[PDB]
Amino acid sequence: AMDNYIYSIAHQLYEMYLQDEDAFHSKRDYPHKKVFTELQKLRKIFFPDFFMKHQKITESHIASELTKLVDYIKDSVTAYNDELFAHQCVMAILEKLPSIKRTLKTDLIAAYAGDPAAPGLSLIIRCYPGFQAVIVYRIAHVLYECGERYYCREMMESVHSYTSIDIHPGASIKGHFFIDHGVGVVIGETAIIGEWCRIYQSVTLGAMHFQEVIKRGTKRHPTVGDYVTIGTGAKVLGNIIVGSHVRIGANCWIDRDVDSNQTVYI
Amino acid sequence: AMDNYIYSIAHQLYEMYLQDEDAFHSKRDYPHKKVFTELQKLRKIFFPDFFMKHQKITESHIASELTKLVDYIKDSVTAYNDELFAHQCVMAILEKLPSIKRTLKTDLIAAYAGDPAAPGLSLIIRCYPGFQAVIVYRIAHVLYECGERYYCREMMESVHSYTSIDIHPGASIKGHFFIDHGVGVVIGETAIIGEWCRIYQSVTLGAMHFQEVIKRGTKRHPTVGDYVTIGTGAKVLGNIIVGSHVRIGANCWIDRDVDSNQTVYI
Amino acid sequence: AMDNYIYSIAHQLYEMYLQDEDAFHSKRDYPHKKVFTELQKLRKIFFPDFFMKHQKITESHIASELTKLVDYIKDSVTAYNDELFAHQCVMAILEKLPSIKRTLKTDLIAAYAGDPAAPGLSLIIRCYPGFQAVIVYRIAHVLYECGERYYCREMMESVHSYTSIDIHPGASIKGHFFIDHGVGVVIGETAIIGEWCRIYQSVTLGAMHFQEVIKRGTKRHPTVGDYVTIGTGAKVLGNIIVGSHVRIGANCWIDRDVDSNQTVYI
């Protein structure tokens, strides 16, 4: 049953690949670079020209990688939770993958448009850390939405170590999303970020806690609108609202609401 | 002789484990994730439920991991120093491990209490980067206190790369210590930090040096009291004193003494 | 032909090693730590006492490592480009290696002189992240100067992940260069940095881009003179000029020209 369901989702993803515009295609066999399991597998599956020898890109081989990835995530969700919760979480992931593939194309488009230094999508797809982070994040988020609270944090801790970008999986982020450079980025469990958000190194959208067992959870991180740019070093803290079309300056400390259509600096 | 001494310290650590409260225990077999030697081994030994299959947790297996760890550290201290200094340094480490185990329990307690996002200790213990850093730091510090100056910096450079947290091993840090997120954290060779210190990403407690061969060593980094919180981005520099119950704001630049019982921001 | 050329460059590098002053020499066999290919190989070749067992340091073994390194880089430049461009790029690299070796000695000298915490050069050479970054950067830069635009960014993305330091390979940096700690450092494609530059963690010399497909390339990052110090957290942005003998404070936001012989802070 889960195997037949995997076959169908691999088939959908194999066809989407086929019909992806030529910017998402390439005939080159690229250098093989082994990375942590969830990333390695999500990469191959979503953007096969860039990570698989041309000769091996086959609907069947894509199913095989999707199965390896499923087993691994199911194995890990089970360890921290139980077999039935795991089964249900992975079904959720499977259901959402076509959708996440679409969103990730849009994040690639935002990355190219936002980065005067990018030569083409092949480079972003292959090596841009912002993009590796978001790939894994969009998967870890489905797991958070299932109610899972352990393995999904451990996934993002793989991101955290590989890229120095720290996105809590409960964060809610829409498409055309781009983190440039990314080191020192931290995004909180209850962060909400809208469309076309561009974020630099050393930005925090989260919270701090001065001393005096702090209450667990609750909405406590910013909500950011659409078309927002947050400059290198800015710390945006608390349950505050940043409107749409806001550009925040470098090293800004934001602790109160920010109205739409502004530029903040000092 | 060192083998009999290792047996006794493993025995002490095997018993402490036994009597650890149930928050530090679990019956789950967790996913295996291989990490740099000193971390991999300190983890297993100190918090065996989280890193070892239940079936293999045996006083004997804990001695075996302690021996592997000893040999490795002794091998590495010898390379940079000499066999007798190495012998003495490792004896020091062995002597201090029960004590460091106690302190690390307290750091776990501070991490849970300080982090609205933490679900339980199993998660901190397994994957929280602040905590992996402190584990290795508390060991590297004993080596610094022995007078060693090479291998102990190289240990923390393993931390530095894995977690992007940069703690010089000569730093003196008490318990109930918590670094949240941690990327960009830098703590200097002569830093002194008291109890219940909570530190965010992008905090420096160290020093800078404007140009015009700078003098080696000497007390030159802050001394921080008890119950201090240092917000995301704060740079606290020079041989200055921060008193107890100080909360420092995000992006603050601290270069002069800070009296106890204050909040600093702008 | 490329093999005979490799023999000659290995021979030059084997002799330079021989005549390096004794600070760049050691009889100790140091602990083996495996790192990403380009770093692993550039290390061995340039500073053989620190990375090779004494018994194996032989003109011949240095040629063998230079050949492995050449093949790997040629293999990777070919993948993204074509065989003739690759051939020409690697010839360029080979031609520049003696020169880069000299510059890297000077960067070691700047690191020791700039860091009260450094015990000797063996430590910098072995484990200092600033230094691993610069090693790979000086090689990736030759590739950028050849016109290559893919593999050279992917090299520095290996740096980015290992060290959390992010230097675009088109950046132009002179000698006696030192990045201390380094996490969060970002240096832009058109950055120009003069001699004796000392840079701390969380410094950016690059650019940001507020929203509303941004133009590609063009001179857009700072140009920094000689003897400049840029303090922890400073963000220096845009096509601006920082003169010589400037010291910039912690967390400073620099967006306009800075005249020579100043100290900037607030």
CA angle B220, B207, C202 (to 5 degrees): 165
Neighbours of A15 (CB within 10 A): 12
Residue type, C226: D
Extract the tokens encoding B100: 């460091």
Helix, strand, coil share (%) of chain C residues, nearest 5: 50, 10, 40
Rounded distance, CA B170 to CA B176, Å? 19
Q: From the CA of B17, how many Å to the nearest CA of chain C?
A: 32
b/e string for B150-161 if b means 16 or more Cβ within 10 A?
bbbbbbbbbbbb
Cα(C128)–Cα(C77) distance, integer angstroms: 28
Q: How many residues does chain C have?
A: 266
CA distance B66 to A211: 36
Q: Do A129 and C253 touch (CB under 8 A)?
A: no
Provide the Cα torsion A108, A113, A115, A118; round to 10°. 60
Nearest-CA residue of chain A relative to B183?
Answer: A184
Asked if B213 and C112 touch (Cβ cutoff 8 Å), the reply is: yes
Helical (H) or strand (E) element with B180: strand B178-180
Give the gyration radius of chain B's Cα atoms. 19
Size of interface A-C (CB pairs under 8 A): 113
Residue A37 token pair: 């399991």
B264 beta partners: B248
Question: Do the Cβ atoms of C122 and B217 come within 8 Å?
Answer: no
Tokens for C257?
Answer: 């020209």
Mutate one of A75, A150, A219 to test the B interface: name it (highest B CB count within 10 A).
Answer: A150
Distance separating alpha carbons of residues B222 and A25, to the nearest angstrom: 54
Q: What is the 8-class DSSP label of residue C50?
A: G
Residue with tokens 């299932």: A146
Q: Which of A79, A208, A215 sits opposite B231 (nearest CB)?
A: A208
The DSSP-derived string for C218-239 is -S-S-EE-SS-EE-TT-EEESS
Nearest to B141, CA basis, from B129, B131, B153:
B153
Helix axes B129-145, B83-114, angle to 10 degrees: 150
- Asked if B212 and C202 come within 8 Å (Cβ–Cβ), the reply is no
Please provide residue B241's backbone torsions phi and psi, each rounded to the nearest 5 degrees. -115, 125
CA C23, C24, C30, C35 dihedral sign is positive
**Burial (Cβ within 10 Å: 0-12, 13-18, ≥19) of residue C195:** middle
Closest CA to B104 of B27, B43, B194: B43
Chain B residues with beta carbon closer than 8 angstroms to that of C183: 160, 164, 166, 183-186
Residues of A in contact with B184 (CB under 8 A): 183-184, 202
Using a CB–CB cut-off of 8 Å, the residues of A that contact B are 75-76, 79-80, 149-151, 153-154, 157, 160-161, 164, 166, 168, 183-186, 188-189, 202, 204, 206-218, 220, 233, 235, 237, 251, 253, 255
Q: Which of C149, C210, C235 sits opposite A247 (nearest CB)?
A: C210
How is A125-189 classified by DSSP, letter by letter?
HHH-HHHHHHHHHHHHHHHHHTT--SHHHHHHHHHHHHHS-EE-TT-EE-SS-EEES-TT-EE-T
Reduced to 3 states, what is the DSSP secondary structure of residue B253? strand
Q: For this experimental structure, what is the resolution in angstroms? A: 1.8
Out of A28, A251, A263, name the one closest to residue C80 (CB): A28
Q: Which residues of C touch B212 (CB under 8 A)?
A: 227
The residue among B85, B56, B63, B79 whose CA lies nearest residue B3 is: B63
Question: What's the gap in Å between the CA of A164 and the closest CA on chain B?
Answer: 6
Of C126, C138, C56, C124, nearest in space to C92 by CA? C138
Distance CA A25, CA A10 (A): 18
Nearest to B224 by CA among B181, B179, B163: B179
Partner-chain contact B211 C233, CB within 8 Å: no
In chain B, where does DSSP find H-type helix?
Answer: 2-19, 37-46, 59-80, 83-114, 121-127, 129-145, 151-163
Q: How many CB atoms lie within 10 A of CB C103?
A: 17
- Alpha-carbon span C156 to C38, nearest angstrom: 10
Indicate yes or no: CB of B208 within 8 angstroms of CB of C263. Answer: no
Q: Which residues of B touch C126 (CB under 8 A)?
A: 154
Residue in chain C nearest A119 by alpha carbon: C149
Please list every residue in chain A whose beta carbon sits closer than 8 Å to the beta carbon of residue B163.
Answer: 160-161
Residue A226: Cβ-neighbour burial (10 angstroms; 0-12, 13-18, 19+): middle
Q: What is the CA radius of gyration of chain A?
A: 19
Report the half-sphere exposure of C227 (CA within 13 A, side-chain side): 11
Report yes or no: A155 and A77 within 8 Å, Cβ to Cβ: no
Q: Pick B250's closest partner by Cβ from A80, A161, A235.
A: A235
Choose among B129, B163, B247: nearest Cβ to A210: B247
Domains and CATH numbers, chain C: 27-165 (1.10.3130.10), 166-266 (2.160.10.10)
Chain C residue whose CA is closest to B220? C116
Question: What is the chain A residue with the closest CA to B201?
Answer: A184
| Discontinuities in chain B (C→N > 2.5 Å), after residue | 212
The string of DSSP codes covering B201-245 is TT-EEE-------PPP--S-S-EE-SS-EE-TT-EEESS-EE-SS
The dihedral over CA atoms of A165, C229, A248, A187, expressed in degrees to the nearest 10, equals: 20
Contact assignment for B157 to C184 by CB distance below 8 Å: no
Q: Give the distance from CA B148 to its chain's centroid.
A: 17
Tell me the C-alpha to C-alpha distance, in Å, between residue C112 and each of B193, C67, C88, C129.
27, 31, 36, 13
Q: Do C117 and B188 count as a contact with CB atoms less than 8 A apart?
A: yes
- As a whole number of angstroms, the distance between CA A30 and CA A32 comes to 6
Distance CA C217, CA A11 (A): 39
Residue C238 identity (one-letter amino acid)? G
Q: For residue C223, give every residue at least 6 positions away whose Cβ sits within 8 Å of its Cβ, in sequence order, or none.
A: C191, C192, C240, C241, C242
Cα separation, B62 vs C17, whole angstroms: 45
DSSP state of C33: -
